[model samples]
Each structure stands twice: as C-alpha cells, then as structure tokens.
Target: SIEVLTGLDPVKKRPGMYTNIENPNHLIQEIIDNSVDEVLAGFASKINITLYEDNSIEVADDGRGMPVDIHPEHKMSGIELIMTKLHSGGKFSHGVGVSVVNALSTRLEAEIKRDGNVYHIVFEDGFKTKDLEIIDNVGKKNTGTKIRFWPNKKYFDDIKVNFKALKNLLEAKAILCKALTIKYSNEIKKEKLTWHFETGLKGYLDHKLEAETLPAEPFIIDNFSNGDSYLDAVFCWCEDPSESIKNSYVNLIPTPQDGTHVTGLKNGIYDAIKAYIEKNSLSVKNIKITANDSFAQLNYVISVKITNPQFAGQTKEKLSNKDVTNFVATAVKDLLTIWLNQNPDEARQIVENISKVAQKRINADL
Candidate 1:
C-alpha cells in the first residue's frame, strides 16, 4: 500500500485499524472519553450520554466547550480542525481525538456553548456539511459541548451498541471520576441512571467486596500524587479461600489485561510483605513465602491518573508509560510499609493468612 491518503480519507477508508470497531460501543466510548477528560481537567461537573430511539447517540458535558475561535495558521475554527484532522488535540499525552469519531460517523453535529452563546456545526461523511456559526444565546452562565452522531453502518463490523457493557464502562468512569456526576439514558429501553460517588476508590471497593478479610480494616490510598500523576488504591487480605476483586485503572480507563501499573503495584506489595517477613522472622515452618501466597486472598483496586498516558493507538487496555512502574512501586511500597507498621497486629494477621496458603502450596505438587 504505497498510496498516500491525506486528511480524513485515510481514517475514513480504514476506520477499524485504529479504533478496534467490534461494535458501535467502541465508537461511543471515544465520545464519552472526551467528556471524561474534561472531568479530569476540572472543567466539567456533569456528563450526560443519551441513546435515542432513532439510532443516534448524544454525549453532553458541562465543560469548557470546543474552542470555536479560528486557528491563526489553518484559518479554520478549532471545531473544524478537531473534527476533521487526526491527532489535532490539546490534551496531548494523550486523549483519543474525536476526529476519528467524526471521520467514521455518517452524520455528526457539534453544539458548543461558551461566552453565553451557543454555536453549532454539522458534518457528513467526514466533510463539513455546515460550517461553524453562532446559533443563539442562553441564560445563566452556561458553557459546555454537546455532540450527537449517527454511526455509519457500512464502516463498522457491527452496528449495534451493547447497552449493558456501555453501562459498565460508564459506571467505571463514574467510580474513577468521583467529582463528576454521570447520567445515562436508554431511550429505547425507557431507562435513566445517574452515578456519583464521593467516597471514590474506597467506596467502589466497599460495595464490590463481600469477602472475609484477615484485617478488618483495608489499606486505602487516596489521591497520592507525585507532582506528575494521581494514584488511588484500596487493598485487604481476604480470609476466604476464593480470590476476590482485582481491578486496575489508568486515567479512568480499565486495564483488564494487566500493565506496568499493575505490575508495579504487585511488585510493591510483594516487596513490603517480603521485607516484613524477613525483618520480623515470620516465615512458616518449612513453608516458603512467595508472592503467590500473599495474593491467594488479595483484593485490591489500583487506579492512577496521568495527564499524558501512553497507550496503544486503538485499545487503551494497557498503560505503557515506563515511569509509572517506578512511581507506583515506590509510592505503594512506602505507603503500605507505613500502613503495616501502624496497624501491626492486623498486618501480622495477613502474614499468618499467607502462611497457610504457603503451607497448602507445599502440600500440593503442581
């Protein structure tokens, strides 16, 4: 393929290559991510996702709307550049630009509310159907962006958007972004749901967990920032045999397949435990204490937020930022060490809980 395709034509021709278009949900996720980024940047307080009966989707946010001013060099409005050009984004390091979303969509409309006036634009087949223009003024100090788009069925493998999975993703975003309120409507199903959590990571863990924990109190790390990124986590050693919740997120995007962030967190946990066992001379009789033994009953949620996230172009299923590994490892190791020292009795109980798991491993030859 030696052909040179320019502008939206490249993305428009091979849309799935960058977006992983299993269904329309991936398309919808890109739109929601834009709002979530606004939530992260302290620009927005509320995000609304509305699914209409006519197969149109709307994502509205009460944030600084899309910049409508003309670019000095391009002479095009910010909205035009953003929607038409790939990688034309301010939130570099990085958030998925809505341009791909715009390129793939058959019909798209942008409503920008800023400086007490509402501006609007329309696009079709990734081309400007209606150029950016002022529409009207609204009362009460309003500003935000609202976009409605229709999925181009011809460009997708599957056109149907899975409401259930989409809701799950929305819930995760709601949990991670504690300050932002999320409202979703399933107009086809006649359902409306709102999610807001003041307790953040701890609240999510408390509701998600039902296992018996060795230590009654869990180790909670809330908004620990290293002048670069934000980290929040909650962990506890469960008394029950079965494995409980084990989740990790980066920039509010769930990483189910594990990444350096999770690897760093695990390394820190093991380091703290191994150090504790060695210092206290707390090994079981003839049974070894490996990291596996400690994780047999481990339940934790680690969520980190960074301005510049390094993820593979299409699927942000992994966090590849190399520095995150060191940052998370040091922070978690230091913080957990302090927590264990402060709660010595309960911490020792977790060590004892690991002892039997180690013993069992020795008994069974795998």
Candidate 2:
C-alpha cells in the first residue's frame, strides 16, 4: 500500500499535467463522468447539468443512487473515499469514480440514496469534514447521485469555465455513445442554456452535418453478438472538402486513440474502394483507391463492446487488446459493402465522392 508523503493529493501534485488543465473546468469533467455513468447504467433515462447560482456546479442524474455502504475491506464508506482519497471509486472496477472532482475541489458535497436511506457527505480540501450522515428516508422516487463542488479557487485562480467547450465535449460523447442522451446548461450571464437531445449519435451526425451538403446519406450498420463482440458503424460523405473522422468507442466509453478498430475501418474502406475502381473502370486517373483516398471524405462512428473490457488506464481512453481490430474491420467491411450494394443511389453517390476525393488529393499532392 502506498502512503501519502505530501500535503496535496498525489494525483493533484502533477495537477493539470494529466488532466491537461488545473482550472475548475477540468474538475467539472469529473462531474460529467458521473452523469455519463447514469446514462450507461440505465438508471438515468436522461442527464442534465446545471451551472447554478454562486459559482456552484451540480451534476444530477436519474441513475440508481451510488452505493454508500461501508466497505468491508477498505474500512471506509465508498462515499467517503469518493470525496477524500485519490483514485477511490468507479471506472477502475466497472464503476465510474468521482475522486478527481473531490481531489480538485476545496469544497465537495455528495447526496445519495440507497435502501430507503438518504445519505449526505462533504469534504473540504481533500479531508472529510462531514462524515456519512443520513439526511432522511425516501419511501421511493428519490435516487441517483447529486454532486455539488466548488473547485479550489487556488487552482482556478482567475480561470473561467467555457460553457461552449463543455457543450462540445458533451456532444462528442453523445456521438460516440450513439444512443445516449446528454444535456448541458450554459448559464453564462443568461437565465439558462440547454443542449438536450434524444436521437443519440445518429441524430448527432445529422445535427452536426446539417449545415453541410452531404454527397451520400449515412447508413446504419451493426453486426454484434453475445455482447462480448459488437460493432456499430455510421458513415456519410460530404462536399465540405475535408477528410473523414471516425469517432471510436468501446463498451460505451470513448476510445480516442482508436487502437485496432480504427485500423480495420481504414483497411476495409480502402479495399472496398479499390475493388470498386478496379471492377468498374471509372477513375479519371485509373489509380486504385487506397484507404487514405477512400476515407479522405468519410465521416463516421465506430463503437465496440465487450464483456470483459481492458483499458490502458484509469481514464480508459484506449484499448490494448489486439484481437478487436480484425473483428471490427470484418464487421464494417461486410455491413458497408452489403448496404452499398442494396442502396444503388447511395452507392453511386459514395463512388462519386471518392472520385472527387481522389482528384483533390492528386491535384494538391496531399
């Protein structure tokens, strides 16, 4: 066991180094993480964050209340660890922990419900000021976790939270998760600002590209089985003159590094286009399309899921298992080609878009 050798929480000594920022904004992300947990566990049908009065932040979820029982081994209440220790809960063991928020804040309070009891706890500067005290009992209808924290002013200094940046991050998460509903409030000098939607990633893609003229319409494809291996892909080509971006995810978590799944999508898309050009004799330059050329104009989401997920770290941003890429690639290849063959107009449009992409790359020597 590692013992504390310093005043600051071990995670905060390198503060802003790993989370990349020391402001309250990064701390607020920990709140967002809790909200996401609600969405994943199905206890919360919807999520909403409020930037309320007095520099206060509240992330309220409809998910089942966080387990507040005493830990038999750790000897401290889970709720206590969530507020006072480093790396104390969630994400590490299929549960999303809120220790980051606790570590970053000078004042943090938690209100939870479990087994008819309502519990409340507060922490000040990484130490428990108020122990797990029962507030009241709810006969029913009261559930989920509500966390309100005032980040250490010392860390934030004069930093201000950008509501736009938060909204963008929430939207990105919605896109990667596909069917999750995420809402945000930007109360910067306004009564309220809301980013609420229910269409999941499919709706997100439509909303994101609504301003652009799409060369080909998106098609939804999925080939998943037994929950351990699953993949979902949605893609479209646009006239916006940009390369494609595949927002990758695994087990409902965003995997930005996009290990093997991304590689497979690239290979599959590349081979499909290569075959199309070779069999149809339709290229202006007669060059076979590589993965680079084909996906240059593509934009899509590729999400995977597994029973026993392995991630690189506590934050869980990348997948280390190598077998997933081939499974994802094969799924995308089969689904996309089958969809293209079934939809003639979309197929032609996609081919045309690829041809234009090829010309642009050739002309620009990119």
Candidate 3:
C-alpha cells in the first residue's frame, strides 16, 4: 500500500484525493458509466450489474470487448494500462475510469470474451499479479467484457451500496438509451430489478405527473440527434409541485447542481410562451411572464451528449460547457414553437399558467 508514484500507487496512497469516499457508490458508478457509454455509442444494448457479498460489484456488457493488445511505449496490455495507470485513458487525464476503481480496491479481475477466446487478468491491491491467460471454456463467438471488483473497505467510511441511488442511476441510463437494457441484482438480498423503457421521455413524463395534474401543455419531446453532439429535452408545465421533479444530465451523467443546459431550458420555454402570447394577443395586455414563471410548476428532464463534455468537478455535478446552453435553448424554442402552433388549447393553457403566476405576483406587490 505504501508503494510510490507508479502502478496505481497514487490512488492507493490517497484514495480520497481522487473521489468521494463517503460510500462505495461513486467508485461503482464509474464502472457503470463505462457500460452506459457503450450503449450511447450504439455498440452494446445490454448492461448487467450484480452486487454480491463482501460488497463485490460486477458490471457486464455485450459491447465489443476492450482492447487486449499491448501499448507500444508502455509494453503493457491495454487492460493493465487502463486499470493500473491513471494516464491510460484516451479522453481524460489526472484521474478517471477503471484505474481509480482498481487503485481503490484490494482485488480486481477483468474477464474479456473476445478474439474467439476468454482473456483474463487479475490485480491484487492495485498491482497486477497474474499474466493475461487465454481460456477456451467460453465460446469464441461470444464477445463482451465483465469486470467484477471488490471495493476495499479501507477506502470508504461505509461500504454499503445505496440501492435507491443505484436504481435511480440505472433508470436514467435506461431512459437515455431507449435501446439499452439494464439489469441489476443483489445476491445477498436475493433481489433483481430490470429497467427497460419503451417510450423513454413520454413514459418518464407521464410517470412524473400520474397524480392527475392539469395538462398545462402536452409533454414536449425534442430530439436533436445529429452532428458531433446530441440533445434531448422532455418536459411540461403542470398545475402544482407536489410530486413534480426536474433533473438534468450530460451524456446521461446526472447534474444535481445543474449547469448551463438548464438555463437553455428556462430561456427556451420562456421565449416560446412569450412568442405565443404576443402572436395570439389573448387578453394578457398587462400581465408579464418571466423566466421564473415557466419553472413555477414545470417538470423537466434534459440530456445532452457531446464528443467532449467539460464539467466543473470530478463528480461532474455541474456542466460547464457554454456551447450546450444555446444548443439546447435553440432546439427547445423551435420545437415548442411548432408544438404550440399545432395545439392552441395546450398553448393557451401554458399561457394561463404563466399568467396565473404573474397575477399572483401583481397582487402580492400591491
């Protein structure tokens, strides 16, 4: 554990320096992200996660197996480099990916079913203890990667995995990738849960307001799926906020603090409402609608995918990309504009909700 400067030494030296050590969820979530990324790229359609005794968590994916060849300069297999070295990741630096998981854990093993064989490797306490061994038991046509790791109890104050948060994460992933199927099981508790969405946003949208809130506006589903980036916005204004929940994510990673894209959602909705009222001129001559009114009882969930995403923290709680704000805002305004034109009743309903908030504001001031 006291080794210096190489071979996962930095992570073993100070695990907390790289991640949140409150619990094992953060470390486990990283592995899940790798699998979700596969689905995002349209490679794999299924991700299986299993939780076992001693807090062992395994993530299995049907994507093309991870690279098995050695890196030229490093002379180490791609798995070894990815798990042991912080610098092996193609898109990130400092600290990220399976390396952090390997470094923080006492034991790690990778099983890759690719190249017509099963390739296996093991790491003990952040050091690779065994060579890559090719096995014949697994079929050649079968291709995927399975990584099962036991997060060391030493790194976390509590080693327990919060099932609620885990399911929330899985559901979001399933919702984001409509074609992806995710399953999670707790061997210790003898429980299994599967999250597969057929309608995604609309399904999530309906669930958000099953309590029979006013259909202020039919759910707005906007999909901007092209270019180097992609943005999807699903939302609606509702009557009240009793169970209305709003969340945003970047590339399917939850942004609790919510960054610029949220600004996009607010501004976009505000613009559409204002545009509709101005065009219709329906007895709102004195009432004023601001950005605040759009969010009064609005339930929304937005997701953006970019070739490269910039966040303010290692946990990516906030999206710091400036381009995403306009990217999302423009898409929302155009979509809502078309939506409002076709459904005047819903449009008028939205205007009424905004006007109600404004009327209350006016009364409170006097």
Candidate 4:
C-alpha cells in the first residue's frame, strides 16, 4: 500500500526532489527554463529577467503566450491548471517542473498577452488568491508571457542572487540559442547586462580562445546526426602546456561531471591523431604516443542532442546513455580523420606535440 500526497504536500515534504530549496538559484532557473523552452519551440526570441531589492524576481519572454481559455477536460482555466498541477505542460515534468516553483514561492503573478488581449492571475503560497481576470481585450498586438515570484526565504538558507553566476549562464544560453536575446537587470544595484549571439557554438569558442595562443585555427564539424541523435563539435590545441579544456553538453545543457559522450570524444580524437601519425611514419626517438599523449593541451566543445536523453541524477550534470558513446565517437573519428588528412601541417604539429608528451611520460616513468 502507498500513501497519497495532496496538493503541493509532496514537494513541501521533499523539496530537494524538486529543487535545491536551500539555494534559490535552482528555483529561479526552473522559471527561466520555461522561457528557454519557448525559444526552442520557435515561439520566442527574447527573455528578460529582473531581480528586485525585496528578494523578488521577474522573468519575461516574448513567446506565444500561455493559453488563457478554460481547459475542456480539467474545466479550470488553462493558465490555472498549468500553475497548480504538478505534471502539467508538454515537456516540463521530466525535470524541475514549474509547479515546484509555484509551491516554493511565497507569491507569484502570471500574465499573458495574446490574440489582442491581456490575461492575468495571482497566486499566494501556491494557491490561487484571485479569480482569472482579463485585464484587457483588444488592447495590444504583442504576444508573450511574464512571471513574477518571491521565493519563501524561510524555506531556503540563502536566497540571494549570484549575479556573476547568472550572467555566465545567461550568456551561455544566448550562445546556444543564437536566435535569442537575454537581458538581465538588478534593480537593487542599478546594474544591467545583455547577451546575444548570432554564430552559435563557433562564436562561443571564438570568445573562449580570443586571448590564448593556438597551434592552428580551430577545427569544427556539424550536422553529424542520425535519425534520432545529433552531434556537433569544435576543437583546437592551445599553446598553454598545462591547460586542457574539454566541455560537453547534452541538448544544450552542461554535463560538467562528464560521461560516455566525453569518453567517445576522447577515443575518437585519439584514433584520428594516431591514424595520421602512423600513416606518415611520424615518430620521435624512443617515444610512443598514446591517447593521453594526444590529448594533452587539447581544448574542445562537444554538443549532442537526443530524442529522449537520460541523465545520472536530478541535476542532469552527467549523461548515462550507453549508446551515446559509440554514436559520438564514430562521428568524431570519421570526420576528424578527414580533416586531419586535409590539413597535413596541423596534423604534423599535433603529432609532434603528442610525441613530446610521450617523451615526458617516459621520463616520468623512469
């Protein structure tokens, strides 16, 4: 037998299952994600976020505004069901759903503009405080969504916004989306920042490498997708002997802990470098290049997209899909080998660098 939890009781009991209530960052991110999803669906291009002095936050997006009509089955207003129900929306339930955001916030206001009308509603402590109200009919041509909330500080340890961290995340999102613009403002501090990217991942990599020395121009490959999965990657060798940067993402979400997809990238890069060295008879005296040797001082970014992705935990910092390793590795190896064959000078430099690493490893062993 099992016990049933009513209303927001489950989330209230185990808040960690829904979000890191101790830190308000996760809860705020949940609402931001809803806006990003709108962009992903080709419904919006702009997202704005504001942090107020009284420990409140507002997130607004220019998307197809949420439906305000009555739900045919649920019988409640569409927006009300979305705000109150646990597993509402098309793709939000798989992660930190907005219902968790509502349940944890002390107050929330949802507004939408669509079909030349404006709709508004208010919630206090996750329950509706007022009936659905149509603020204006035939008022404006704009269509979008706006959400304002105050996270209940009593339930959280530190509810302050880490502006630096939020800026980095917003910039990354803008880079990944390319078509979207993100604006962030802090009313308390009188500061503002905006991010927009037109060149996607390549632009992000360019920015990362701007002040660094490189062995060669970056190598980029795209459109490496099968029917159900997609993989794209960019890589280069930096002159900094002690530096190695390898970032991987699954469906535009960072996988910092790394998993099988990164393993595949390592294997594929090693194979390509090794194949080139062997074909050219490139070797140094008493040096044998290995995967570790070839990977030294390498910088790379690999992004993958899957239909139904799997993660190791609720945070989704790692991917656990066993098939992704082969999927990514094969694509990287095949295309990278082709690039290596075409750029013989770069290939020679890479092989020479690996040979030097091998010599250093041999010396350490001795």
TM-score of each: 0.85, 0.78, 0.87, 0.82
lDDT of 3: 0.79
Q: Could you give candidate 1's per-residue lDDT for residues 1-366 as a string of tens digits? A: 232224887777777665767777877888888887888888999999999987889999999998988999788998898888776332443244788888888899999999888999999988899978888998647999999999888877777778999999888887777788999999999999998878776645455665556556677888889767888888877654455588888877778776878888888888898988888888766887887777777888888888778775556788888888888988888898888888778878888878888888888976
* TM-score winner: 3
What lDDT would each prediction earn against the true structure?
Answer: 0.82, 0.66, 0.79, 0.79
Q: 67-185, model 2: which lDDT tens digit per residue? A: 78688977888777555555522342333246766766778888887777888988877678888888899867767787888766666554466667777776666655544555566
Q: Provide the lowest-lDDT 10-residue window in model 2.
A: 88-97
Q: What lDDT is reached at residue 243 by model 2? A: 39
Give the lDDT ranking, best first: 1, 3, 4, 2
State the local distance difference test value for candidate 2.
0.66
Best-to-worst ranking by TM-score:
3, 1, 4, 2
Q: Give per-residue CA lDDT, model 3, range 1-366, as digits (tens).
A: 232224677777778777789887888788877877777777888899999977888999998888989889779898887878775333444227688898888788999988788899998787899988986656666788899888888889988888788888787788877678889998878999998876666656676677554454346564575564788777776665576578898888778888888888888888888888888885566677778887787888888888777888666789889877887777788888888898877778777877899888877885
Give candidate 1 misplaced runs (Cα > 4 Å). Answer: 1-5, 20-22, 88-96, 138-141, 156-160, 203-209, 239-244, 278-292, 311-315, 358-366
Model 3 residue runs over 4 Å out of place are: 1-6, 88-95, 137-141, 214-218, 241-244, 313-315, 362-366
Clashing residue pairs for model 1: 93-308, 93-309
Off by over 4 Å in 2: 1-8, 18-22, 88-97, 176-179, 183-188, 193-196, 203-215, 222-226, 243-246, 250-256, 270-289, 305-318, 352-366
Model 1, C-alpha of 333: deviation from truth (Å)? 3.0
lDDT of 4 by residue, 199-218 (tens): 66774455666645344567
